Design a binder for this molecule. Structure first.
Ligand SMILES: Cc1cc2nc3c(=O)[nH]c(=O)nc-3n(C[C@H](O)[C@H](O)[C@H](O)COP(=O)(O)OP(=O)(O)OC[C@H]3O[C@@H](n4cnc5c(N)ncnc54)[C@H](O)[C@@H]3O)c2cc1C
Ligand SMILES: [Cl-]
Ligand SMILES: [Cl-]
Length: 423
């Protein structure tokens, strides 16, 4: 256990760092400081303003089982109050189809879903635990498609792909099942399939800005950390404006990047070097022939269509001059990765093909997205190692790499970090 008097440095004012501060504070750890590199809080919950309304450059949605986020809202006073999500499906040629009504493929898919639900309820019990420290079944360490194939459930990929590949998380040929099924566990998949999805009028960012404000120590912003060292049982942080000592270090920032400004030991260097991530690019667009509904494009979710628009978000139905965001991936382990420029051109051409041509791109962002490890590295015990290192030289590891790249998962992980190590 850790002394309540400890000076605790939390790096990153995204959901993970903000949650860490919240749950530390509610456990009686009052001497924490959150250090944020940018001038803003919420990280990839990022909801900029346009014509009196906030649009989403990052996270958009939750589901009713996001219990930790509910706890945050309980604290902040925020309410789930955004516009209803609705979707149609488009082929890569822009034609509308209704796959749930396909009388051959539909049943095959839902039968596979049924079958997978029972394997999850019986054989793979534990799969849905937050984090990876409870070692998942070995089958879950395989790429999702391989995991499905082993169990005869390939068809279920049709349901699972839409809120996964399109949402930036990569491709089932390579992404381990462990990640997929921690995010899209059975209740979560059911909620999404049904459209029972939380959104916020003021943006996902708002409740995090509000959480920060409720904190006893709101985040320090514009903190440029040049160096962290950990001699003599302490943590020393060097920034461009000061350098100070803490007792405990909580990392919610990318761990491979941490290597470059830290006295990283051999294990840290070895293991964090294996972290891979996604290049998920979002374009905030003004369009003609305004869509009446969000569009998903499964055809463009295939690795062979890397860089094409996989989904676009219809957020403000009443105003045809409001922002439509588009979503595409720029990388895949087995395909040549795509440039920003050539992908920008695909946004334009695909949106035209869909009959919603772009008048203007007002904002573009390639995000550092979904840090994870390969199936091989997962099977080789990556998480047993790294979780084994928790508390080493008073350093604790958290954020997306330790759980999943979603704001409930990381917040939940931070909450549990306090329980596991601090209380
Ligand atoms: C387009 C898009 C769609 C998404 N959709 C959803 C969704 O619908 N549902 C969902 O649950 N999640 C979604 N997400 C994922 C979700 O937003 C993230 O998983 C969540 O924000 C992770 O929180 P975090 O604190 O772990 O990481 P981040 O949000 O990335 O926050 C990291 C923070 O650390 C800071 N930082 C980085 N480096 C340093 C440094 N050197 N020093 C100090 N500070 C540093 C950053 O500025 C940032 O504030 C989406 C994200 C994007 C981009
Ligand atoms: Cl104490
Ligand atoms: Cl949707």
């Amino acid at each position: 256990s850790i002394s309540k008097d400890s000076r605790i440095a939390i790096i990153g004012a995204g959901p993970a760092g903000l949650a860490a501060g919240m749950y530390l504070e509610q456990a009686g750890f009052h001497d924490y400081t959150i250090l944020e590199r940018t001038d803003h809080v919420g990280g990839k919950c990022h909801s900029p303003n346009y014509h009196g309304r906030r649009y989403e450059m990052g996270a958009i949605m939750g589901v009713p089982s996001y219990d930790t986020i509910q706890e945050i809202m309980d604290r902040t006073g925020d309410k789930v109050d955004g516009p209803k999500l609705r979707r149609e499906f488009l082929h890569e040629d822009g034609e509308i189809y209704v796959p749930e009504k396909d009388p051959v493929r539909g049943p095959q898919v839902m039968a596979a879903v049924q079958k997978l639900g029972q394997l999850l309820a019986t054989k793979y019990q534990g799969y849905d635990a937050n984090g990876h420290y409870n070692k998942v079944h070995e089958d879950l360490m395989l790429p999702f498609d391989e995991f499905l194939a082993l169990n005869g459930c390939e068809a279920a990929r049709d349901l699972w792909i839409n809120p996964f590949t399109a949402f930036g998380y990569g491709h089932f040929d390579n992404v381990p099942a462990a990640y997929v099924l921690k995010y899209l566990d059975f209740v979560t998949m059911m909620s999404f399939a049904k459209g029972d999805l939380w959104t916020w009028a003021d943006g996902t960012q708002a409740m995090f800005e509000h959480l920060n404000a409720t904190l006893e120590h709101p985040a320090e912003r514009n903190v440029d950390i040049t160096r962290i060292t950990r001699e003599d049982g302490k943590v020393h942080i060097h920034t461009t404006d000061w350098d100070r000592e803490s007792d405990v270090l909580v990392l919610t920032v990318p761990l491979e990047k941490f290597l470059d400004y830290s006295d990283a030991d051999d294990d840290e260097r070895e293991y964090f070097s294996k972290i891979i991530h996604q290049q998920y690019m979002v374009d905030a667009c003004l369009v003609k022939e305004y869509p009446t509904i969000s569009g998903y494009v499964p055809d463009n979710m295939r690795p062979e269509r890397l860089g094409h628009v996989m989904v676009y978000y219809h957020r403000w139905a009443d105003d045809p001059h409001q922002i439509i965001t588009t979503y595409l991936l720029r990388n895949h382990p087995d395909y040549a990765d795509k440039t920003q420029e050539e992908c920008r051109q695909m946004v334009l051409d695909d949106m035209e093909t869909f009959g919603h041509p772009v008048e203007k791109i007002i904002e573009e962002q390639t995000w550092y997205y979904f840090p994870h490890v390969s199936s091989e590295d997962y099977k080789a015990g990556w998480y047993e190692k790294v979780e084994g290192m928790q508390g080493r030289r008073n350093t604790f590891y958290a954020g997306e790499i330790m759980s999943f790249g979603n704001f409930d998962e990381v917040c939940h992980y931070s909450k549990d970090l306090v329980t596991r190590f601090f209380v």
